[PDB]
Amino acid sequence: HPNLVIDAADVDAMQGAVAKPGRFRSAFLASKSAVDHALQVPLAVPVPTDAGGGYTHEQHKKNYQLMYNAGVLYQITEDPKYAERVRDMLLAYADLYPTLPLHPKRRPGAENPGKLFWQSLNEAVWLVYTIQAYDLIRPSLSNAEAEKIEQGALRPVAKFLSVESPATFNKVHNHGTWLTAGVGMAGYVLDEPEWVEQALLDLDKSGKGGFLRQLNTLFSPDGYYNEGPYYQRYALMPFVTFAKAIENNEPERGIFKYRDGIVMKAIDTTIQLSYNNLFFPINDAIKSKGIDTSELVLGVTIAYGESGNPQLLDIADRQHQILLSGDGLKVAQGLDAGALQPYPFKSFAFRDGKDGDEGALVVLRQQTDGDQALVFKPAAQGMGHGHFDKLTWQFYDRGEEIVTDYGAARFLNVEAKNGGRYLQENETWAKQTIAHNTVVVDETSHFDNNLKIANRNHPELLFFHADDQVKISAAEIDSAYPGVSLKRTLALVNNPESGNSFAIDVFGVESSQKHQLDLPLHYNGQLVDTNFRLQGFTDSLKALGTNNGYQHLWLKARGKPDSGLAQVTWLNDNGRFYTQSSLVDGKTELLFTELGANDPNFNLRSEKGFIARRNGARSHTFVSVLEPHGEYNPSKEFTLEAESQVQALQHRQAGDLELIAIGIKNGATQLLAYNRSSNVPEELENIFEYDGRKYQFTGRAKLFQIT
Amino acid sequence: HPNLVIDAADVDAMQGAVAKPGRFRSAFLASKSAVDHALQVPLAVPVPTDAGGGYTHEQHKKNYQLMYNAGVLYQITEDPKYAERVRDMLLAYADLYPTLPLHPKRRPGAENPGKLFWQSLNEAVWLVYTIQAYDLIRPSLSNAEAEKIEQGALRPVAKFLSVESPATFNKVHNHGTWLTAGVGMAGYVLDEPEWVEQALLDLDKSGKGGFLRQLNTLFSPDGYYNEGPYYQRYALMPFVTFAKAIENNEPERGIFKYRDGIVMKAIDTTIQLSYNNLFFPINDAIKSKGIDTSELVLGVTIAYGESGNPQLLDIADRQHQILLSGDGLKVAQGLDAGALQPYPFKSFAFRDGKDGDEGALVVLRQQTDGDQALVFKPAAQGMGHGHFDKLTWQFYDRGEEIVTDYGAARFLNVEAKNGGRYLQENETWAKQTIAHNTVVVDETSHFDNNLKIANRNHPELLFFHADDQVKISAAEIDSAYPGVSLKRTLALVNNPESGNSFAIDVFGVESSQKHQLDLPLHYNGQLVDTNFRLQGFTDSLKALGTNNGYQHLWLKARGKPDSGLAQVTWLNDNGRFYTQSSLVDGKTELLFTELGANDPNFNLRSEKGFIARRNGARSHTFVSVLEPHGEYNPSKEFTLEAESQVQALQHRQAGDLELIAIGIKNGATQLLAYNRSSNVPEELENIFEYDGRKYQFTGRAKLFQIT
Numbered sequence A, B: 001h002p003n004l005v006i007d008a009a010d011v012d013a014m015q016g017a018v019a020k021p022g023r024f025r026s027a028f029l030a031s032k033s034a035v036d037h038a039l040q041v042p043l044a045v046p047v048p049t050d051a052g053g054g055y056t057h058e059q060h061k062k063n064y065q066l067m068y069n070a071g072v073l074y075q076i077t078e079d080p081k082y083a084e085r086v087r088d089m090l091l092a093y094a095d096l097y098p099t100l101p102l103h104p105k106r107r108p109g110a111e112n113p114g115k116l117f118w119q120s121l122n123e124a125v126w127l128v129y130t131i132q133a134y135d136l137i138r139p140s141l142s143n144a145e146a147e148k149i150e151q152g153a154l155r156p157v158a159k160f161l162s163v164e165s166p167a168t169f170n171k172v173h174n175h176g177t178w179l180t181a182g183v184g185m186a187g188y189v190l191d192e193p194e195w196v197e198q199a200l201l202d203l204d205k206s207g208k209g210g211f212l213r214q215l216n217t218l219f220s221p222d223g224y225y226n227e228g229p230y231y232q233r234y235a236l237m238p239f240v241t242f243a244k245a246i247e248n249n250e251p252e253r254g255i256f257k258y259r260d261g262i263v264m265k266a267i268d269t270t271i272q273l274s275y276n277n278l279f280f281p282i283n284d285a286i287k288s289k290g291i292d293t294s295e296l297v298l299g300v301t302i303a304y305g306e307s308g309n310p311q312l313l314d315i316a317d318r319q320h321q322i323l324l325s326g327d328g329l330k331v332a333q334g335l336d337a338g339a340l341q342p343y344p345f346k347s348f349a350f351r352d353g354k355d356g357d358e359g360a361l362v363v364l365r366q367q368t369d370g371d372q373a374l375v376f377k378p379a380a381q382g383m384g385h386g387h388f389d390k391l392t393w394q395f396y397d398r399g400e401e402i403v404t405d406y407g408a409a410r411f412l413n414v415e416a417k418n419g420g421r422y423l424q425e426n427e428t429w430a431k432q433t434i435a436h437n438t439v440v441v442d443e444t445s446h447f448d449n450n451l452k453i454a455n456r457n458h459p460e461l462l463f464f465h466a467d468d469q470v471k472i473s474a475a476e477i478d479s480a481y482p483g484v485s486l487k488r489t490l491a492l493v494n495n496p497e498s499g500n501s502f503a504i505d506v507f508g509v510e511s512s513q514k515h516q517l518d519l520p521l522h523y524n525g526q527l528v529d530t531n532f533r534l535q536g537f538t539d540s541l542k543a544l545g546t547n548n549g550y551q552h553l554w555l556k557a558r559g560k561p562d563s564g565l566a567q568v569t570w571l572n573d574n575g576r577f578y579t580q581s582s583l584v585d586g587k588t589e590l591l592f593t594e595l596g597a598n599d600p601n602f603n604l605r606s607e608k609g610f611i612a613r614r615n616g617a618r619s620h621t622f623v624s625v626l627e628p629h630g631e632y633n634p635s636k637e638f639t640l641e642a643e644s645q646v647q648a649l650q651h652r653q654a655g656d657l658e659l660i661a662i663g664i665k666n667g668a669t670q671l672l673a674y675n676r677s678s679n680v681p682e683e684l685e686n687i688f689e690y691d692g693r694k695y696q697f698t699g700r701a702k703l704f705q706i707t
């Protein structure tokens, strides 16, 4: 009876593969050992009393996982003990569920209620796994056992998640995707076709919500999910699960061709939104989440099963987790056959919006100086999970996040931390603009915290270009603060001769009115030196400000460099020094902060940053260069080039061109020249004059060496 | 000509091994590649201008490293390009060194000056490496080149390091070992036997100083170096280097048998004083230093060449660094031959003092619940790098430091941080007792920071016992504070029935006068719960105190739990929760701190801790249990047992016995019973009554399960 993600054909293929040495057999033996041990322990289907991370919540989660794993073993081995365990647990659920009220630890202000769980989302995950387990063990049951499980457990849960909470079922968000996927698959297993249609087109079958609306709205043409990478991988699992079930049940729907293969694009982009295996922590996001997460392990197997792309074996190899499925077997076989090819992590502008015209998530990468990623976020809001952070950036180098995004104020599945829920400081700190590396006007967050306006306004991607020496993008938004135009261009560059790299930042603010302008740099590392006088406050600390996140920042020190070049140098665990060299006009303060004020429940990390503060400016440009330099090896006990190699910095406008000149110690000046305007063909010619000589280049941009 | 660590026998064996494939050939090729690349850069022997971490400091360090490596490559390849580079660098040193003043960035308060370097310590390392390089390339030289090199560089350096700085040269400390090693090896190479004898017996050759006194004084009979693990590995290099040269030139001295084989013991104990490859950060210490440090890579090859112990190959394998020497070949061959045997990290009391009577460094390990180490420090002062930390402890679990020692306030080889020197806050914070996990009386450090009193006093180790279920040690000191006695016993225990483990702490304070008593607990991880009301200060922070390190702690929160059981729970990145359960009397405050006050140069990390404070006590006992519990997996997204499983705690005396009974939720109480007397035969019988039942055990201690 398996006919959801796994079908009978997959079981027969798995049965043959299990008795041949290889990755698949070894994964099978490991699952079998674990399930056999778990079968020794009595079933635990407790009355639900705990919130996220609590015993009842985690036990119910463990139950769905065991029921799925045992069902897979039952199909492969034909051993009845696996089905009997799944049956006994389902009979227990069938007796418990009808008697359950809404969860005692429900918090409806945060999320909709569940019966098994504090929130409906976990119940939806439970249905997605449990329906598959039932589908896998259904041939083992008597008719009365099936009827009791369906009438007491499966149908009441399907009803609870759909007709009984219809607003969320018809919503176009990850929570909707989980609910639609579970009820739709239940429609297939229990022969309820209307449930499949309700999953695809909403409860009214209108078309306004449902699975198809989600695929047409939440993803851009580049496969980029509007809520961001961390919820991208989360929603991926019900997308590829229900899509695999649609293809096995109604292949005439052409689900894997729908919207020009959007399901495959979505899988691939999920992989791309990572560095050193971790998803970029933009918007609401837990920084530990990586590509070995179960949703992307599954997604890769499904995409490899559809395409046979050997590049996906590279990812599967890094995930270190063989799945007991037909597609999981295909992955295991390609790996055993040596078919692996490297996976191409791209510099790319992943467009945002269903039509691709609501900004973009830009990733700039280069390997000349090690693994480096500059992540630029001129993206749309991302809805409730979105941060108020237009044009913010991050910088990754040598395995580590150097210029940082906080992610969410949330301790996942830690019940003592408010049931693992999003904390108050996720609104008052983590979402605020001052928590990001982008301009804050008048100590006020972008859109002044107005969700509806934020949801309707987005930056415009002006351009993106990437070649071997220059990766560069610019974007603009005039709606973050009406009357203020915010424009940023960021370049990731490398010089082949030196082996050196730079991140270059040109942040232009233009207003007809005077404003306070803050540009934070939140960094990871230890402050080691400054160009200018800086002594920290010594016997008391006070918060930087009063609202919009400023109330959480302790002010540790205040500097006001003389006009010219300001330099801030820190040292990272990864063995590198980082110096930001910025142009200051003598009216710019540098405020050094530590996160942790107005934090009575110890909910925030002691993160460090410095803010460039320019008061009373109508128009201002923040020009800066981030220089990774030197080597620090505390094991062999040597240090090289600990001092910044930048001596001078100049920024000039030359018609439609922007020039950034970086003077290097005992070295040639690095001169970034790029064309500023919208459309620039690849062979367009440019010249300009710098220091009495003439320079010429084709296309968007060129880095010159001036000896 | 090579006759020091490397002799001609070694060279011959290496030459035949570099043709055959294997670990040695791969190391050779990697070295040859690095040096060949170095040879294409012209030599740089600059006039010394910078302090530690600066250009000339790090260049002169690069130079001795390259001279040694190029010299070894000369001997193996017989290719004069390597010797010619070494020759040309030494001729530049011969011309430069006699013109040199004392170093312009000398800081004679911190360390004695050098000429090549700001301190003579680096000059001694330079000599140790360079005398070996000169020895390796000598047969390539003309007599006039040899005379110029010896007259202008080698002899002036050796003379500057001995007769011109005689106090330090005759000193018995790590600075002394480096100086005497270089001069003694110069004595062998330049045929100055008086220098060899001065190296072994001091300049006046009295025997008060010198290398034999160092081996007889700075190590205990257990091979524990008095200054601590971080300086043990430092001194280990000159110790084993000179010893190996002595054995190759004067094997009649039997140096590897001297003092019951102290050198081999010294190597083995250096390996023992680590957890997950890092040395215990006690006394002045840099936390990143681990067993791959060059001194211990060398010491392990030399011990393997002496003893052939296949267990040393385990360490070598973990170090991942084959050495181009005769011993390093033998190590590579044994590894290739698959002779590796697991190295045994033991529970052990490493005695302190020349004769092993000045306290001890006690390490308790178990493996039942993962890799765990309890480090207890009832040790001698350790001279000027010693910390004021009698009876302090650390806890390590699942790869991480959980209960912490700060180590030193110093940024090794970062010139912008005071030349990589020990910083002011090393004295005012890192050495202070409040920075450690031990009792502070009246906000005053042990011995009141008086180094002369501290050097004359040490705790007495009372007992130490390790079996598979209980590891336990106790010690006491009555001289840390006038009229106050301090006694601590620490136990590491495991229960087989559950996978559970506990660290048990009983800290007794006895005095005829009332005092304020502080017991800090410095922890690594995120605070997640308390069983008593705790709200952090929200709008400002102020230092906890005014002196002896209290001026560096921000007080973030204050709690006063009710009489009974206090519980503090934090979450560590290793995926485990930790709960300290402590007995409190309603009069004990718990103060939550963050390091960072009075730190104007950003010299301190933001470390966290909590302090149990009890005022007006004459005698008081701090009883607590540290419980690692649960699993936190944010990749798979599950949590198990996040809540502490301790329900109750009781401490009782029963004659010569102490009882600690730990109530477990849904579990048998764990009852630790141990005899307190110094003398306890293994077959001694103990009997006590607890809750109506009678219990008996043989020997020192036993953990009982009470259902």
Ligand SMILES: [Zn+2]
Residues within 6 Å of the ligand: A281, A282, A283, A284, A387, A389, A405, A406, A407, A430, A431, A436
């Ligand atoms: Zn964010």
Ligand SMILES: [Zn+2]
Residues within 6 Å of the ligand: B281, B282, B283, B284, B387, B389, B405, B406, B407, B430, B431, B436
């Ligand atoms: Zn210390």
